[PDB]
């Protein structure tokens, strides 16, 4: 069990219902790095950039390989850092390192000196049987001996999306967090990140549509970025609805969504609309034990009515990008994929 | 002093701060009727339909002569009632009768058996020197004897608008009500009501513009009619701003105004907006001691910053109509006006 606490009051509050204390790196990009070390050298197996930010369990985040936003300069650091760790820890086989990038700054989240659940995905993306190799390394056959020394960077985009069990436990708030709840994952391959994500998204059983009306109800910290997303949704032909505070901000930017009522506000309210299959998309971000408990109805309704929803703005952006792609336009075999690698 | 109470709780409330009790005729048209009685006949001097509903003092209302929305059928009833009254009360010279029309039904508000302040405006509009005629009647010369026996209905519209002293007492809520606060009045002459109104309004020192951004903030009981008004302003080329509840209503009608925060809501709020010259027009209707006192800010700011504002929906419609006219287009002299009378 892990929880994110925002203020002093919040602290106690936890403590009640309730030890390591760690500063929470807000508005940070989470990254996964799987590599192999034989004591001589380090092979970077893969650098994966999570769509959802730090604060949403890596196991429940979608991810990209290669990274789709991160600078080469920054990857390189992470790359260097790993290597440092790999030798220091005396890693012999597979390892995994999780970072957080905030303000062009690389922070260390943790190091797992073993095979991580990311391995298979990378293996598939890169064509390198990381598990086998590392195995061979563990048994005494160096990377140099294996002829696996250079890090592979694929020509295409490899996106991993997860599947959540919420529909099996309705009394639960289908909301992301620091604790992992997913049971499985899917993989999307595309020429473009937008194409890969669209494949992964569909693959994950999403009910996202390429039209209709979107509901936007984001948290403060997001109110500022929501604008561009609304704009993207608007470019696509979506009609917008928005709750008070978010409508305010949109409006202030030249965007007038249709104002909707919260549940305790009037009628109809969001639940009603959701229920009536008024939406095709819902973006809903929240921050705070209270804010969360209070928005619980949106999410529960959304899940129940099968409306694709995102609980992260990062995730909303990706959903948006993918509207530009066509998941059924082109198919490629794993064999072909791997053949494309130089 | 006079006040309008809405519910039991409201009654006590008043009582505290605080007797003739009268049912208030909501959503009713107020009408003024000036006439002369010589004991033999009754001369209808004029039938003036106010713009502002009953509840807003006749002295503080703009008015039209002739009526601009009242059926001939209904007027005729009021004309017959005035007659009945004239003879019954024994009037000899001037009289004024006040009615309220609600649901096609004529209701009597009061009878002033003397010269009313509307007498000069009616004389002007009609070319008939009512005070001079009623004076002769009082002195002994009948209507028949002076050859003033038929009611005059001018070929043009005559609108009267008032001037209020709120700008002299800033600590005062510049809102209309059952008590008269106006100091003076102006007259507008036009080929149509819209033209007469425009001239009256301009005449009144209104800072109304034909473009810009309007702010709509209406009461429940008005949220239905507001839509049409919102549309009218839209047709004109105005951009709309509105508060929550209003925005909700407009939204459901397909009109998506730019959301604006009430003062307690956040930022920016109307006060800020008004202060920063964003609006060129304001429509704010309010009902209830509490509702009123809360909305006080809008009105005060509107007056301080010199934005034209209407505190009645009926007023807003009239303002709307006059946007279609040009009060500088054509001028006419009183001698000319009177010469057009047949
Ligand atoms: N300091 C932190 N700042 C932001 N997010 C963090 C922080 N520590 C952990 N997280 C988030 O919580 C997740 C779980 O943390 P982690 O220590 O790796 O847990 P686990 O033991 O389950 O592997 C991360 O994948 C990340 O999204
Ligand atoms: N029963 C009523 N229903 C609606 N409006 C009314 C009613 N009684 C009075 N009013 C409003 O109050 C104003 C003043 O009432 P009135 O009896 O004429 O007082 P005063 O002697 O000052 O003229 C009217 O011009 C009208 O706007
Ligand atoms: N990979 C996380 C699941 C995505 C889900 N639509 C959410 O945003 O909650
Ligand atoms: N006829 C009364 C003055 C009108 C003023 N603009 C108001 O609506 O309050
Ligand atoms: Cl359950
Ligand atoms: Cl004052
Ligand atoms: K993450
Ligand atoms: K761990
Ligand atoms: K009136
Ligand atoms: K009176
Ligand atoms: Mn972890
Ligand atoms: Mn009166």
From Swiss-Prot, chains A, B:
Annotated Mn(2+) 3 binding lies at: 98, 110
Q: Name one GO biological process term.
A: pyrimidine nucleobase biosynthetic process
Query: Is Zinc-finger tagged as a keyword?
Result: no
Record's subunit section: Composed of two chains; the small (or glutamine) chain promotes the hydrolysis of glutamine to ammonia, which is used by the large (or ammonia) chain to synthesize carbamoyl phosphate. Tetramer of heterodimers (alpha,beta)4.
Which residues of this UniProt protein bind Mg(2+) 3? 98, 110
Residues that bind Mg(2+) 4, according to the entry? Answer: 110, 112
What this protein is reported to do is described as:
Large subunit of the glutamine-dependent carbamoyl phosphate synthetase (CPSase). CPSase catalyzes the formation of carbamoyl phosphate from the ammonia moiety of glutamine, carbonate, and phosphate donated by ATP, constituting the first step of 2 biosynthetic pathways, one leading to arginine and/or urea and the other to pyrimidine nucleotides.
Domain named MGS-like: which ranges? 206-342
Q: What is known of its domains?
A: The large subunit is composed of 2 ATP-grasp domains that are involved in binding the 2 ATP molecules needed for carbamoyl phosphate synthesis. The N-terminal ATP-grasp domain (referred to as the carboxyphosphate synthetic component) catalyzes the ATP-dependent phosphorylation of hydrogencarbonate to carboxyphosphate and the subsequent nucleophilic attack by ammonia to form a carbamate intermediate.
* UniProt-recorded name of the protein: Carbamoyl phosphate synthase large chain
Binding of ATP 2 occurs at 23, 25, 30, 55-58, 98, 110
Q: Which GO terms describe its molecular function?
A: amino acid binding; ATP binding; carbamoyl-phosphate synthase (ammonia) activity; carbamoyl-phosphate synthase (glutamine-hydrolyzing) activity; metal ion binding; nucleotide binding
Q: Which organism is it from?
A: Escherichia coli (strain K12)
Does the entry feature the keyword Metal-binding, yes or no?
yes
Task: Give the record's family classification.
Answer: Belongs to the CarB family.
Question: Domain of life here?
Answer: Bacteria
Q: Which residues of the full protein are shown?
A: 724 to 1073 of 1073
Q: Where is this region: Allosteric domain?
A: 206-342
Q: Which residues form the ATP-grasp domain?
A: 1-139
The residues listed in the UniProt record as binding Mn(2+) 4, with positions renumbered to this chain, are 110, 112
């Amino acid at each position: 069990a892990m929880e994110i606490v925002y203020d002093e009051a919040d602290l106690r509050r936890y403590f009640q219902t309730a030890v390591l204390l760690d500063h929470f790196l807000d508005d940070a990009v989470e990254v996964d790095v799987d590599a192999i070390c034989d004591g001589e050298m380090v092979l970077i197996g893969g650098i994966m950039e999570h769509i959802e930010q730090a604060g949403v369990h890596s196991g429940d985040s979608a991810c990209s390989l290669p990274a789709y936003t991160l600078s080469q300069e920054i990857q390189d650091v992470m790359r260097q850092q790993v290597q440092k760790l790999a030798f220091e820890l005396q890693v012999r086989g597979l390892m995994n390192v999780q970072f957080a990038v905030k303000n062009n700054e690389v922070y260390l989240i943790e190091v797992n000196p073993r095979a991580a659940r990311t391995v298979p995905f990378v293996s598939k993306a890169t064509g390198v049987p990381l598990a086998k190799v590392a195995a061979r390394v563990m048994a005494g056959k160096s990377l140099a001996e294996q002829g696996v020394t250079k890090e592979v960077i694929p020509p295409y985009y490899s996106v991993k999306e997860v599947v959540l069990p919420f529909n099996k436990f309705p009394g639960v708030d289908p909301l992301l967090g620091p604790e992992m709840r997913s049971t499985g994952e899917v993989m999307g391959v595309g020429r473009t990140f937008a194409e890969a994500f669209a494949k992964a998204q569909l693959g994950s059983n999403s009910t996202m549509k390429k039209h209709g009306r979107a509901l936007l109800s984001v948290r403060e910290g997001d109110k500022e970025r929501v604008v561009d997303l609304a704009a993207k949704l608007l470019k696509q032909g979506f009609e917008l609805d928005a709750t008070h505070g978010t409508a305010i901000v949109l409006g202030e930017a030249g965007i007038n969504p249709r104002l909707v009522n919260k549940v305790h506000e009037g009628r109809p309210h969001i639940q009603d609309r959701i229920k009536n299959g008024e939406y095709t998309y819902i973006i809903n971000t929240t921050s705070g034990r209270r804010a969360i408990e209070d928005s619980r109805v949106i999410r529960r309704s959304a899940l129940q009515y099968k409306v694709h929803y995102d609980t992260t703005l990062n995730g909303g952006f990706a959903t948006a990008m993918a509207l530009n792609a066509d998941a059924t336009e082109k198919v490629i075999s794993v064999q072909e994929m791997h053949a494309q690698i130089k």
